[PDB]
Design a protein around this ligand. Structure first.
Ligand SMILES: [Zn+2]
Lengths: 157, 76, 177, 136, 116, 47, 50
RNA sequence: UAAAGAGUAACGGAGGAGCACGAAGGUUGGCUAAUCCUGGUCGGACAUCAGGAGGUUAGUGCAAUGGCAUAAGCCAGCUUGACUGCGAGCGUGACGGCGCGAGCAGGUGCGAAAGCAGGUCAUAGUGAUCCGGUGGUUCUGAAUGGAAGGGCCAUCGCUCAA
RNA sequence: ACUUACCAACCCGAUGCAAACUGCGAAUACCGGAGAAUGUUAUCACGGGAGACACACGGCGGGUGCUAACGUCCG
RNA sequence: UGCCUGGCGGCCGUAGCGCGGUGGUCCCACCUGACCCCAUGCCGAACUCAGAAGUGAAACGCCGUAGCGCCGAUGGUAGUGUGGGGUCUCCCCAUGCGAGAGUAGGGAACUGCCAGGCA
């Protein structure tokens, strides 16, 4: 509706692209980014400062022509700034004590709602979780419980 | 309504009038449509820019059953 | 071509004794037969048009043609180039062969028939019908029909007046109105 | 008041009042009023002149109108400098060139025509004259 | 119309050959006998013309208009065009599809030694 | 006429119950059973 | 924007390639197009249209 | 607006573009609509039409304009000339740039051939240089041989949108 | 099927207007050629040096404005 | 070389449209016989064939018809270059160029080459 209205909208997308290049390689693969865009990211930091502007012009160019919300939404989870991400972790730890203290009454909800949960391994993990807590041993396996639930949270496959 | 803007009107129109000699390959008239049709020894450009194909003097003729203005050149 | 012979031996001499035509071939002759078909809703089901073409392929001796939309209209959800109906043109010996099937068996089998129309004329001398329940024809089987359909048959004639069709169909023996 | 319901463009250039007349002679009635001066007629003036003469002529006869507004004009609102687009919609006017007929009359004697046209001539901002239809 | 349809479709070649400024060989079909003419590049005059109507060739054929007889009129017009010195013509479709009795018309001229 | 694109053209012998035997260019099949015909039809009596 | 720029590489062993644009969304199939190649002085097929 | 070469401004009036098309390009062949009359079934103010005054008021991927019957409008087969190196000459701008471009060498597609094809009927669909990726070039390679690096060519590299 | 102090599509004859309409269409301007006469080559190419890139008014044809302006912007 | 017909052109309505008459030995257009040579997103109206039995119905050519379309004066008028003037939003004067529309009138074509048929 206004040429300058598009301008600030496009410029806002430009600084978003400048945030992707300023993000580490290990966390770069987390976002569902296409290979064509991904390949342009690695060349962006290794190019000289003036070429970064051209690369920033590149990154903005084919990022506007496609959908942006899933990329922005996925980036928000990694930054842990989207509201649904932090509450998801709240319920993820809310089912820990619901499961680590009983071990039988909490598995029903997980299997009924999530069909990719390996109940063969989950029961054994709770067996170790009960053993370490009862024997007042350091929680060397409690961390792995959260990783498995977190991994299955976003379709581990 | 946010008006006040116009394009740069490029240089068209009858530009090589009849009775003058031109060298081969020189344009005669730059036109949008086929206001003037190519005639004897005259070629039509991609954008209907009539260009000469041989040396001579340009003459203007109105030929055809539809009274269409044709552009032709004769060897001098 | 038994009607073509019937046209040659009796029809031609009858008309010169009636309208005293100067030229023997000046008398108008049949040119072609038009069978026009239209489904209830083309966009609803394309198989209906395909079945309609199959029915027209059964009634005629040749495969019919599919017609495209003449012009798209935005208010009636019709797009340009979209197949909207089916048709077939018959030429050569096909006029005389198809004409006998119409008047000998097809028209007499029409339910509640009291006479074909005697007013549907364009003003020049070409005579047009639109008939319902094409199932009267024996080629179209009554068990394979999916719905009740119709057919539009028109005659093509070089006649210059509507009154001249009166005489021509009289020679072709249309019963009455 | 008189105005076309639909216009091709919401506003039109100012234009000029140069040139000669076209409708020198009346071709519908026997008597008519012809403009002698040069100026402009608005919708109000046309309505006022027609109303003023209508009260003087009985329904017997016939009345013709030869002037239409056909020309839009706008006015600039208060406390606005030069620019900010063109003016706002206030009213329209018509172009008048001296020599063409304004109103045409028929059906009642000349004496009533003189009285009727005299009453409507004053409310017109231009000097007019009376003419009689001739052969051909 | 029957005649206007072929006239309007053949002027595309007529303008093209006129622009090229080269002689053209034009033929029009008739359901009984076929003509054949050769036109100068100017178009205001002919150079050689030979048809099958002349009785010289109208006695050595079965039917006037046919493929078998088309190779005779085509050869005859080409034979008498050799001494003219033109040595070259340009064929025109003349609004008729290039197949049928028109095949032998051009083939006979090509076989006689005309470069087109 | 183009082959392999049009339906069959087999000769058939049709006959109405009245007794009018005629050969009709049609594609009904092995035989064509009819009940009425152009003749012997009560059209000129009903009107 | 929606269009994706693509490169057409000669099916021969040479590395000479041509540049062009095709909409992958509507035409995801690889192109079967042959164009002149100056290095081999002939006409060669071009493939791998992204 | 713009005053009959070109060009000509304003907070002058109306608008559009940052694409798309591997077909919607080329060749060859073929064809010609809006609107209305009569007749015709579900069918109505289009369904597709049979007969008619109209040869384009229809259409021309999109805003407008100018053109388009030899149709540039419509359909089908083959198709890549939307090719490589060029390109005398002309026009437009102060210039960078941009556009037209006959014709030459090679290899092609169409049709029998004459010939056409260096993109789309045309006019907006775009970005010069510096510096980055790829391939080629033994072009060069700070002692010799390499290598690194640099150069040249094509190429994707801007909301450089001030 | 009848009727009405209501309205009216379309066509016909006449009458106008239109920068964004032209079945028509000037005077001038512009381009080129030929020629007698005149004009300190006043014409063009290149090189050196500049200045300037804030114009106002009047007439003519216009845009805006009320043809309101010692009004603005145009040739 | 005289008349008629056909093809390719000159010019593009004084070149056409409409009405009436005329033409079939010859030159043209419908109409017949239809294994094939040419190929379809659909038949031999309309384009490709091997045939002259009929007809000049439609079309085409020719002649007349001024109903329409069209061309078009002379004068007049609007406009305008140059210079001057006025009561200067617009006009006049001297001179030059001269509209559009309308009227009288014209107009039912002319011409080049070649081929065929009748004298
Ligand atoms: Zn019976």
């Amino acid at each position: 509706v206004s040429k300058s209205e598009i301008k600030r909208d496009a410029e806002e997308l430009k600084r978003l692209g400048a945030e992707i290049v300023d993000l580490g390689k290990n966390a770069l693969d987390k976002i569902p980014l296409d290979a064509d865009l991904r390949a342009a990211i690695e060349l962006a930091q290794r190019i000289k400062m003036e070429g970064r502007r051209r690369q920033l012009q590149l990154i903005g160019k084919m990022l506007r022509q496609r959908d942006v919300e899933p990329i922005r939404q996925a980036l928000d989870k990694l930054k842990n700034r989207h509201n649904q991400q932090v509450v998801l972790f709240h319920k993820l730890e809310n089912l820990r004590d619901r499961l680590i203290d009983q071990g039988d009454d909490a598995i029903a909800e997980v299997l009924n709602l999530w069909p990719d949960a390996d109940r063969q391994q989950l029961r054994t993990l709770i067996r170790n979780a009960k053993k370490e807590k009862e024997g007042n041993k350091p929680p060397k396996s409690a961390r792995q419980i959260f990783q498995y639930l977190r991994e299955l949270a976003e379709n581990e496959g | 309504t946010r008006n006040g803007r116009d394009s740069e009107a490029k240089r068209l129109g009858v530009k090589r009038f009849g009775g003058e000699s031109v060298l081969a390959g020189s344009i005669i008239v730059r036109q949008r449509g086929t206001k003037f049709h190519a005639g004897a020894n005259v070629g039509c450009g991609r954008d209907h820019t009539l260009f000469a194909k041989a040396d001579g003097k340009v003459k203007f003729e109105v030929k055809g059953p539809k009274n269409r203005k044709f552009i032709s050149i004769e060897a001098e | 071509a038994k009607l073509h012979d019937y046209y040659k031996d009796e029809v031609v001499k009858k008309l010169m004794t009636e309208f005293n035509y100067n030229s023997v071939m000046q008398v108008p002759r049949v040119e072609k037969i038009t069978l026009n078909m239209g489904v209830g809703e083309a966009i609803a089901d394309k198989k209906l048009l395909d079945n309609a073409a199959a029915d027209l392929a059964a009634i005629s001796g040749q495969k019919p043609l599919i017609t495209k939309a003449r012009k798209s209209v935005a208010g009636f959800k019709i797009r340009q180039g979209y197949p909207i109906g089916c048709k077939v043109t018959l030429r050569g010996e096909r006029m005389w062969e198809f004409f006998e099937r119409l008047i000998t068996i097809a028209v007499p089998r029409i339910r509640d028939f009291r006479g074909l129309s005697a007013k549907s004329f364009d003003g020049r001398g070409n005579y047009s019908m639109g008939v319902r329940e094409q199932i009267i024809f024996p080629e179209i089987d009554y068990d394979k029909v999916d719905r009740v359909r119709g057919l539009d048959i028109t005659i093509t004639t070089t006649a210059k007046s509507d009154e001249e069709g009166r005489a021509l169909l009289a020679a072709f023996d249309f019963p009455f109105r | 008041m008189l105005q076309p319901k639909r216009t091709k463009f919401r506003k039109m250039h100012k234009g000029r009042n140069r040139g000669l007349a076209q409708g020198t002679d009346v071709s519908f009635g026997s008597f008519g009023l012809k403009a002698v001066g040069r100026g402009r007629l608005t919708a109000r003036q046309i309505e006022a002149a027609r109303r003023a003469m209508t009260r003087a002529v009985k329904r017997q006869g016939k009345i013709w109108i030869r002037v239409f507004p056909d020309k839009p004009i706008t006015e600039k609102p208060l406390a606005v400098r030069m620019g900010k687009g063109k003016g706002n919609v206030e009213y329209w006017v018509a172009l008048i060139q001296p020599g063409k007929v304004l109103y045409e009359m028929d059906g009642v004697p000349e004496e009533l025509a003189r009285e009727a046209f005299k009453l409507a001539a004053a409310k017109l901002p231009i000097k007019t004259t009376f003419v009689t239809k001739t052969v051909m | 119309d029957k005649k206007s349809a072929r006239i309007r479709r053949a002027t595309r070649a007529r303008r093209k050959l006129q622009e090229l400024g080269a002689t053209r060989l034009v033929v029009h079909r008739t359901p009984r006998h076929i003509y054949a003419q050769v036109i100068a590049p100017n178009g205001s005059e002919v150079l050689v013309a030979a048809s099958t109507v002349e009785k010289a060739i109208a006695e050595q054929l079965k039917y006037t208009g046919n493929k078998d007889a088309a190779a005779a009129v085509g050869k005859a017009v080409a034979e008498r065009a050799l001494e003219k010195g033109i040595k070259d013509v340009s064929f025109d479709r003349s609004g008729f599809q290039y197949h049928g009795r028109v095949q032998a018309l051009a083939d006979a001229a090509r076989e006689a030694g005309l470069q087109f | 006429m183009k082959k392999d694109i049009h339906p069959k053209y087999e000769e058939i012998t049709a006959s109405c119950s009245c007794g009018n035997v005629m050969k009709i260019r049609s594609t009904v099949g092995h035989d064509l059973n009819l009940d009425v015909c152009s003749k012997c039809h009560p059209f000129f009596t009903g009107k | 924007g929606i269009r994706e720029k693509i490169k057409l590489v000669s099916s021969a062993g040479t590395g000479h390639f041509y540049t062009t644009t095709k909409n992958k969304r509507t035409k995801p199939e690889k192109l079967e197009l042959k164009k002149f190649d100056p290095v081999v002085r002939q006409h060669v097929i071009y493939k791998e249209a992204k």
